[PDB]
Amino acid sequence: MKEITLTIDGKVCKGVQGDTILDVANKNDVYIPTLCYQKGLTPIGACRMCVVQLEGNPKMLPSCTTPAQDGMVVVTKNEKLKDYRRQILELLFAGRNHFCMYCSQSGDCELQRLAIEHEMDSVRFPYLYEDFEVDATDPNLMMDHNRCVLCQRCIRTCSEIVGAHTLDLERRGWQAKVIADLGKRLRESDTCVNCGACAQSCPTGTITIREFAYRGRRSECDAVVESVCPLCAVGCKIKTYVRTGSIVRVEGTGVEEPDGGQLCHMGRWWLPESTERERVTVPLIREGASYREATWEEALALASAEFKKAYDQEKAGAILSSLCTDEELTLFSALFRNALKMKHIDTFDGDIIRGFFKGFMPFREQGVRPFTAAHHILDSDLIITMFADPQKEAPVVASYIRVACLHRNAKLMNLSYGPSPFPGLVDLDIRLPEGQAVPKALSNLAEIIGKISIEESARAMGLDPKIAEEVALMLISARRPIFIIGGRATKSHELVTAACNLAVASKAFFEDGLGVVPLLVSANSLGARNTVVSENPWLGRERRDFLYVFSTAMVPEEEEILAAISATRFVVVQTPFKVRPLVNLADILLPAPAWYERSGHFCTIEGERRKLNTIVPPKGEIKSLHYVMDEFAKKLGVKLERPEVSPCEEIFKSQLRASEARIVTL
Amino acid sequence: DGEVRIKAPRGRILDQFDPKDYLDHIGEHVEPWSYLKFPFYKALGFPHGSYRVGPLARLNAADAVSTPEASKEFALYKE
Amino acid sequence: STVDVVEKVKEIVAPWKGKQGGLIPILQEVQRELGYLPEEALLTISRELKMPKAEVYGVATFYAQFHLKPRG
Numbered sequence: 001m002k003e004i005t006l007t008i009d010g011k012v013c014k015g016v017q018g019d020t021i022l023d024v025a026n027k028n029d030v031y032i033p034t035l036c037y038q039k040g041l042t043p044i045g046a047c048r049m050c051v052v053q054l055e056g057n058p059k060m061l062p063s064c065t066t067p068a069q070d071g072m073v074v075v076t077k078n079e080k081l082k083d084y085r086r087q088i089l090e091l092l093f094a095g096r097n098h099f100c101m102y103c104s105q106s107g108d109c110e111l112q113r114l115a116i117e118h119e120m121d122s123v124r125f126p127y128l129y130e131d132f133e134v135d136a137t138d139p140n141l142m143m144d145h146n147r148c149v150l151c152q153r154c155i156r157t158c159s160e161i162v163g164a165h166t167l168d169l170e171r172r173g174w175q176a177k178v179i180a181d182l183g184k185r186l187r188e189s190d191t192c193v194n195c196g197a198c199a200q201s202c203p204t205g206t207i208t209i210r211e212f213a214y215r216g217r218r219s220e221c222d223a224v225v226e227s228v229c230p231l232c233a234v235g236c237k238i239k240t241y242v243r244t245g246s247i248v249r250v251e252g253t254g255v256e257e258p259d260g261g262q263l264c265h266m267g268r269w270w271l272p273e274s275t276e277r278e279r280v281t282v283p284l285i286r287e288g289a290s291y292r293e294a295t296w297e298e299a300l301a302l303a304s305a306e307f308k309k310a311y312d313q314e315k316a317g318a319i320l321s322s323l324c325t326d327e328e329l330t331l332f333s334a335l336f337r338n339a340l341k342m343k344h345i346d347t348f349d350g351d352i353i354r355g356f357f358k359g360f361m362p363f364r365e366q367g368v369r370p371f372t373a374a375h376h377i378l379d380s381d382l383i384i385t386m387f388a389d390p391q392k393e394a395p396v397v398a399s400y401i402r403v404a405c406l407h408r409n410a411k412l413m414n415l416s417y418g419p420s421p422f423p424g425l426v427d428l429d430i431r432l433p434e435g436q437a438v439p440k441a442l443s444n445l446a447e448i449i450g451k452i453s454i455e456e457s458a459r460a461m462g463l464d465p466k467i468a469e470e471v472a473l474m475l476i477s478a479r480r481p482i483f484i485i486g487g488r489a490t491k492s493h494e495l496v497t498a499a500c501n502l503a504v505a506s507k508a509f510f511e512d513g514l515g516v517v518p519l520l521v522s523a524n525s526l527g528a529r530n531t532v533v534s535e536n537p538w539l540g541r542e543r544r545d546f547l548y549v550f551s552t553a554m555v556p557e558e559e560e561i562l563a564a565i566s567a568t569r570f571v572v573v574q575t576p577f578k579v580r581p582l583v584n585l586a587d588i589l590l591p592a593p594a595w596y597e598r599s600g601h602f603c604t605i606e607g608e609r610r611k612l613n614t615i616v617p618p619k620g621e622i623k624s625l626h627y628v629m630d631e632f633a634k635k636l637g638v639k640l641e642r643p644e645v646s647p648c649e650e651i652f653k654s655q656l657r658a659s660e661a662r663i664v665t666l
Numbered sequence: 667d668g669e670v671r672i673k674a675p676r677g678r679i680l681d682q683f684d685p686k687d688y689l690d691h692i693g694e695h696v697e698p699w700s701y702l703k704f705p706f707y708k709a710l711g712f713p714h715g716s717y718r719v720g721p722l723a724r725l726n727a728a729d730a731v732s733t734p735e736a737s738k739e740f741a742l743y744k745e
Numbered sequence: 746s747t748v749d750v751v752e753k754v755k756e757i758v759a760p761w762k763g764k765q766g767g768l769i770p771i772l773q774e775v776q777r778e779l780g781y782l783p784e785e786a787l788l789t790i791s792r793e794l795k796m797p798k799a800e801v802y803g804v805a806t807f808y809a810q811f812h813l814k815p816r817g
């Protein structure tokens with residue numbers, strides 16, 4: 001049938017034969033008390049607050065773990081159930097030490113709300129005054145075990161959703177406790193990624209983000225806006241909470257998607273920490289070791305005066321940010337690429353972008369999409385990490401890797417000259433020596449398409465024949481492998497093709513493309529390429545006498561890029577913050593809107609666009625970015641010719657299905 | 667006495683700070699072939715944050731001098 | 746010695762690698778040959794079976810037969 005119907009509280013509800021009673025109740029509107037239930041986690045059955053009874057049967061059934069069967073009458077509210085639930089809440093309060101007066105979650109705690117809805121004004125039990133540890137060793141997260149209901153939703157979030165299995169239960173019985181690795185404090189645990197997925201999963205105020213205590217209460221917010229995390233390419237959906245013009249809490253929407261709502265340390269620490277920064281708010285001038293306030297006319301006049309006297313002598317450049325939206329990039333490109341005919345328009349991440357694209361183009365000319373969705377790592381069997389460190393570039397990808405290798409029985413092998421970014425999950429660390437190992441790798445995978453020689457192709461790879469032999473032996477025994485190619489490999493557009501060829505040489509196909517899943521550092525990769533990113537590297541080579549640098553000062557920049565900016569003899573930055581690395585190397589420091597103040601679409605690598613919503617409206621009146629672009633177009637003798645956005649063109653089309661072709665273009 | 671001042675290779679002053687706040691700005695990189703370390707400005711790393719010290723770097727970072735016959739030659743050095 | 750137990754428990758986890766189970770017998774045999782489960786033993790068991798440290802400490806402290814400190 002797959003279409004059943006029940007009667008909850010007299011109200012007839014519809015559902016499917018596979019769900020539980022709590023799911024059928026939540027599906028329409030119906031309310032049932034829950035404390036250990038979390039959408040996105042397998043039902044646990046610990047609080048026993050969701051108890052429910054049928055007519056005739058005097059037994060009590062947990063609505064969250066008992067399946068729904070057509071024809072049953074469900075009763076959620078009566079004297080017996082109210083009494084039992086109040087007794088459970090009173091046990092929870094009398095067992096542990098609940099001090100609502102100074103709890104950080106003292107207005108948005110599930111236990112406190114369940115206690116107030118059941119009219120709890122006494123505990124009726126002797127109030128065991130036991131000493132529980134308060135763990136504040138980690139500067140960011142606090143675990144106050146005086147407030148634990150032992151719902152285990154923290155142990156289920158760090159195991160099935162995150163992968164960093166840092167939490168579990170200590171000694172059984174009433175002495176149950178949530179511990180870190182080997183009973184250590186959270187700060188001594190090495191298997192923690194500081195993602196805060198546990199803080200979002202905890203219903204009580206045991207796990208708490210420390211720096212936003214007493215402010216990040218969802219009950220005393222002013223507005224809730226959902227948008228996307230701009231920091232990395234994964235683009236996790238968020239649930240920003242705003243209070244008095246400040247982001248107090250970032251929660252992960254998407255408890256239905258494979259990410260599970262876990263955001264990275266950046267997504268839920270930097271974004272609320274960004275709204276309380278120094279906010280340039282007025283054009284500055286260096287004046288020598290100490291900035292000075294200036295009007296817009298003065299700052300723009302001096303900036304354009306130094307910009308003209310350098311553009312005539314071929315020496316000028318622009319370093320834009322790929323965390324910018326498609327409209328800002330379109331305007332920048334309209335000024336620099338289609339109005340000034342400039343040639344030095346690189347991006348802070350232009351090298352990774354140009355490398356990935358020039359390594360994947362050997363496959364665009366034959367009609368194959370040379371990558372797949374990042375969430376297929378869970379369905380794989382052998383994950384090969386090629387010059388990647390996802391814990392610093394794409395934490396949700398690292399979470400997929402950990403979940404697959406620790407709970408879905410996958411094998412991990414490293415193929416990089418690095419620190420083996422997963423020291424304890426890899427079983428084959430293949431460290432390549434530098435030089436020209438790209439042709440070596442491509443000839444090595446050539447044998448896997450034909451014979452499936454090796455010694456000759458395993459000399460610059462710095463592997464004795466045996467090492468490369470069993471590398472190939474494990475690569476051939478895998479039915480659905482996957483490769484993770486990092487941004488280091490983009491130091492040469494050859495190694496990207498080498499990885500994409502190792503992908504075809506082992507039949508790593510998916511219905512969306514190959515098993516390559518590149519780790520892009522920004523989200524507007526295709527947008528930046530089509531608009532701003534240059535074709536040849538020029539930073540650190542051209543001395544440069546003038547430089548425009550638009551940097552949304554959110555993610556750090558490579559030391560080399562900043563050293564090239566420091567030697568440019570004039571830099572005009574249009575950052576919104578007064579952070580250290582940009583106020584150190586800057587001459588004007590014009591103000592610009594922050595990421596939580598403008599809207600955009602973020603044309604991505606895999607095709608169709610995302611959408612960033614404006615969370616907090618702009619405070620002051622900076623009044624434009626087109627203004628600066630015209631005062632640079634004027635004072636220089638050009639027209640801007642305002643264009644509209646270029647459409648998403650799906651650069652890598654899936655024309656023909658999974659018909660591999662080794663590309664001898666080395 | 668005075669404050670520590672680092673000048674970019676083209677004249678701009680980059681992180682003029684107070685001497686006691688040096689652990690926030692200077693770090694030493696160690697190389698296997700020398701008992702000598704390599705100090706560098708931390709915000710630019712190694713080997714990009716490395717700078718020069720000495721008479722040349724002093725006269726380049728300082729803006730003026732306080733003695734007559736040395737100023738009369740500091741001008742000729744600056745030009 | 747803390748270095749003796751490393752290899753000594755390596756030789757006890759050897760017959761169990763890649764066999765989908767049998768962790769409480771490993772802990773039982775490390776208890777039989779040491780009288781208690783030290784932190785080094787648990788760390789090496791976790792590193793060899795590639796089972797998280799939280800899991801091995803949770804199952805080691807679940808049963809009353811085991812002991813995390815040297816016994817009298």
Ligand code: SF4
Nearest residue numbers: 099100103106109205
């Ligand atoms: S966790 Fe909830 S019930 Fe416990 S003290 Fe804090 S607000 Fe009160």
Ligand code: SF4
Nearest residue numbers: 158193194195196198
């Ligand atoms: S911060 Fe993340 S990794 Fe650490 S315990 Fe919490 S959920 Fe697990």
Ligand code: SF4
Nearest residue numbers: 149150151152154202
């Ligand atoms: S810390 Fe929070 S989520 Fe974890 S068991 Fe205790 S109450 Fe539940």
Ligand code: SF4
Nearest residue numbers: 229232235236264267
């Ligand atoms: S993984 Fe990327 S998209 Fe997700 S929260 Fe972190 S930075 Fe944002």
Ligand code: FES
Nearest residue numbers: 045046047050064
């Ligand atoms: S909520 Fe139904 S048993 Fe915990």
